[PDB]
């Protein structure tokens, strides 16, 4: 029950501080290449060990040998005026890097892509890895659809956990709130599309104030990694290969609601959307493939 | 924050087992007519390290100031003289000794509520989880109406997390456990305790429980059945008001079903 | 991750109930000769909800790879039969019954263990706390021996985070427990979710629980009362082998006060 | 149940995210100077608010206004070459600006203070403040203990909640493991002097790879503030006054048992140590002096 980190940053820290709130790790290895740094912050973690339950870093990736599961976070330090194109590509380069050690130390571990774009970057891995589509897994729209439903179960007196809607496509813009599926504890709500855009635009501002998000991202992959190392059949908007869905015709990936566990996705929701969501959702996929067509792998 | 448990019968305990394993409680009381049985508070007393609660009492004006009364048995103007909270009634039939419990008080409706169909959408739900290989907490959907075998599944709701006979099969094996038990104890106390969290930490959260329901659905007189209910540190907050005929009728032929003008008040 | 628990008494099932709220089991296995009332399995089977456990299996060869075994009743060839697993007696006089329980099973001193003293400490380490004024986490202290009123406080190591009567209330409580109810079923179940949670997830945790003691303060027959153990994956790991003369001849004492003889193998 | 965290680093924000993990908040605020930076770090809390249970950010102290406890973490940026003593002095400017503002708006608020030298910056609040002892708390050896009893725990083979030691005086080189007071589940181990010089020591290449502690400390604070907030009467090693304890006779603070709940510190232990140890604290109450005693309040 091991699981691995690679890259020791914003998110990679947040991302491994909230694996490590969760009982979920027997051997946690962190991992990227400012050695000075790896061991800092596995130092600062094993410091508090009486206040967690759990860990590795280093730059050798032998130290992954059997991860149960890999949660992948490098990104590449953005420029400006740089285009969204430059940068897909210098992170499909970095993952060149990073797949194949992954694959190489533990070709049965599961994915988990959460760097950016992580639609592209979950095929770029799939691609790859030769994984099958089960451990090929990314952050996608989970934390979207989670924040989704409590900013409208505020607007409305109730807990969150009793608001039930998701948000499918891009991790990104064109995503899509599937308003045929608000639920409120067994009532469809035919018994909003603004908290939409206020998540797509929060999550801008983010990344404008701060450079980028880590507390939100890391509590999501947390949410994921539950349920995967656990296995508890659970189902989150997540990026896998939807060709054959809602018209797309390419291997374009995007998130829609799969069921997690013990071997990644058990299987992929095929959903019965509105005339007008299944189109956005073919936009939506319109708008990734118009950045993954260009990418050399 | 004072709770009060009447009747330690076997499901006032697992009512009080369970409100004291959710560690709601800073003081827990336990009344009762027969007195050697209740003096179960030292035993609850004796495992309080495992527990998070620093006061059990139990006797015979002991629950005053009270947040929450859960009434179990087997009273109510007794509680009221001390504890005039919030009044959950477990005791069956539900939905009609909840009329009772309010008119017997007069409390507002926030603050009477009746378990209902809490435990029997909480089970319901389970048995779609576990047919479809999903985790229970993903799959969405109520049974409301009268805690029996007239209760009402609302399939207009069913819900996947967002998306779009099992019935029959929760109320009939309500019936096995009664005949080869006499008394069922260890499932309402958690639907109890799950439903004295929300009351006691203000969680809003949306359950199926008994309170007033005429002007829904066309009924036309005082009946207390399950409707979804959002509930609170003030009891009931809202109350959730339209589905498909072939079910808003159900839930009068479950009013109907719903004994009321028999019985002297 | 398959646990049994024989004997539906009113302890088996707080034993259950417990082992199940602390979510442990994969599948809870209840056992015992009446059945109408085993087939509580549906009971507990229908706040599943509310738990964390998929199978709960009652009857009368079902405890088979079972991982624990918590003996209540009210037996052990049958155990082993189908389950050769930790075996954990809670039957009183657990100190005499755990020497029938390793005898019986031929299994090894690991796999042997009793409730003991877990409760008795428990308790005890709680009221010195309340009369401090400090929460019961940060006070340390065991009554080790037997599960009685022979027991004996660990002055020599009582501690409030690393520093330096109330006793007899422990085990004259325990008394009036018996004679107001007849049975301990709360209290008893606590205790034993405790020791099983540091079983099954191999916390490797101090408890006091009855084993082997001959070897320690004198003593010279096979009598198990109870010592703090470093319980988990694999029952007893380690053994904690030194106090006061004035409270190591206690310990004999007690080994002397434990009917032993007295019975046939 | 107002929690304020004063300063928006690496220190306040695993503060922040540790106080989030825990129920603990009602309201919650962050305060520093750089705007963009408060609101990116709320924003950021918020985005995850469905996984947590609590936000606000700003720069002007009114926010504050009625705190329960109000955790102070701002420290300055420690220049190489500069001297303890110049950076203990920056670090009580630093306080001449914190407290009035926190005691101004919230004259009823348990202090915590977390940034160091914690010893003497809690001697420096509670002068600047004027509050009574039990509302001036610092970290002090709550994390030195902790870690401490956790690897002689590993060293045996026993479970750290079973194992009772503590490290008490200056939070720092100079601090003293109390041998006497050793315990395994109520047994005295009378019935390891180098796990100490483990923890003081990997407290400092931490500093040294990574500039600060930061997931520990704030780990440690969130043991602390379960206490108070809650109001266990949890008992934990912090610094306040023991004039008058172990022959010191100057007014210095230093990390001793003390019981904690949501009047702050409700007793002060008064230990009762070998000659050598009460020696040790008493040499280590003579370092923290050697270095208060030159400081301009």
Same mark, same amino acid.
């Given at each position: 029950?091991?699981?691995?980190?690679?890259?020791?940053? $914003?998110?990679?820290?947040?991302?491994?501080?909230?694996?490590?709130?969760?009982?979920?790790?027997?051997?946690?290895?962190?991992?990227?290449?400012?050695?000075?740094?790896?061991?800092?912050?596995?130092?600062? +973690?094993?410091?508090?060990?009486?206040?967690?339950?759990?860990?590795? $870093?280093?730059?050798?990736?032998?130290?992954?040998?059997?991860?149960?599961?890999?949660?992948? /976070? $490098?990104?590449?330090?953005?420029?400006?005026?740089?285009?969204?194109? %430059?940068?897909?590509?210098?992170?499909? %380069?970095?993952?060149?890097?990073?797949?194949? #050690?992954?694959?190489?130390?533990?070709?049965?571990?599961?994915?988990?892509?959460?760097? #950016?774009?992580?639609? *592209?970057?979950?095929?770029? $891995?799939?691609?790859?890895?030769?994984?099958? +589509? %089960?451990?090929?897994?990314?952050?996608?729209? #989970?934390?979207?659809?989670?924040?989704?439903?409590?900013?409208?179960?505020?607007?409305?007196?109730?807990?969150?956990?009793?608001?039930?809607?998701? *948000?499918?496509?891009?991790?990104?813009?064109?995503?899509?709130?599937? +308003?045929?599926?608000?639920?409120?504890?067994?009532?469809?709500?035919?018994?909003?599309?603004?908290?939409?855009?206020?998540?797509?635009?929060?999550?801008?501002? *983010?990344?404008?104030?701060?450079?980028?998000?880590?507390?939100?991202?890391?509590?999501?992959?947390?949410?994921?990694?539950?349920?995967?190392?656990?296995?508890?059949?659970?189902?989150?908007?997540?990026? /896998?290969?939807?060709?054959?869905?809602?018209?797309?015709?390419?291997?374009?990936?995007?998130?829609?609601?799969?069921?997690?566990?013990? #071997?990644?996705?058990?299987?992929?929701?095929?959903?019965?959307?509105?005339?007008?969501?299944?189109?956005?959702?073919?936009?939506?996929?319109? /708008?990734?493939?118009? /950045?993954?067509?260009?990418?050399?792998?």
């Amino acid at each position: 029950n091991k699981i691995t980190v690679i890259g020791v940053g $914003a998110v990679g820290m947040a991302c491994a501080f909230s694996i490590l709130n969760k009982e979920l790790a027997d051997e946690l290895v962190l991992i990227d290449v400012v050695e000075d740094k790896l061991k800092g912050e596995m130092m600062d +973690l094993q410091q508090g060990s009486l206040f967690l339950k759990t860990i590795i $870093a280093g730059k050798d990736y032998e130290l992954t040998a059997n991860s149960k599961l890999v949660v992948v /976070t $490098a990104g590449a330090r953005q420029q400006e005026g740089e285009s969204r194109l %430059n940068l897909v590509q210098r992170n499909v %380069n970095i993952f060149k890097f990073i797949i194949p #050690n992954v694959v190489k130390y533990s070709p049965d571990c599961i994915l988990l892509i959460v760097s #950016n774009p992580v639609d *592209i970057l979950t095929y770029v $891995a799939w691609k790859l890895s030769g994984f099958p +589509l %089960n451990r090929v897994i990314g952050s996608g729209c #989970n934390l979207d659809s989670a924040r989704f439903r409590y900013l409208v179960s505020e607007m409305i007196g109730i807990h969150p956990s009793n608001f039930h809607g998701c *948000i499918l496509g891009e991790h990104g813009d064109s995503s899509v709130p599937i +308003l045929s599926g608000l639920n409120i504890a067994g009532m469809s709500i035919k018994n909003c599309k603004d908290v939409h855009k206020k998540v797509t635009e929060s999550a801008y501002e *983010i990344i404008k104030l701060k450079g980028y998000t880590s507390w939100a991202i890391g509590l999501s992959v947390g949410d994921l990694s539950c349920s995967l190392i656990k296995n508890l059949r659970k189902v989150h908007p997540v990026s /896998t290969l939807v060709k054959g869905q809602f018209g797309i015709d390419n291997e374009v990936f995007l998130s829609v609601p799969c069921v997690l566990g013990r #071997n990644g996705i058990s299987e992929v929701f095929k959903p019965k959307l509105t005339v007008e969501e299944e189109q956005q959702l073919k936009n939506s996929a319109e /708008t990734i493939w118009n /950045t993954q067509k260009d990418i050399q792998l």
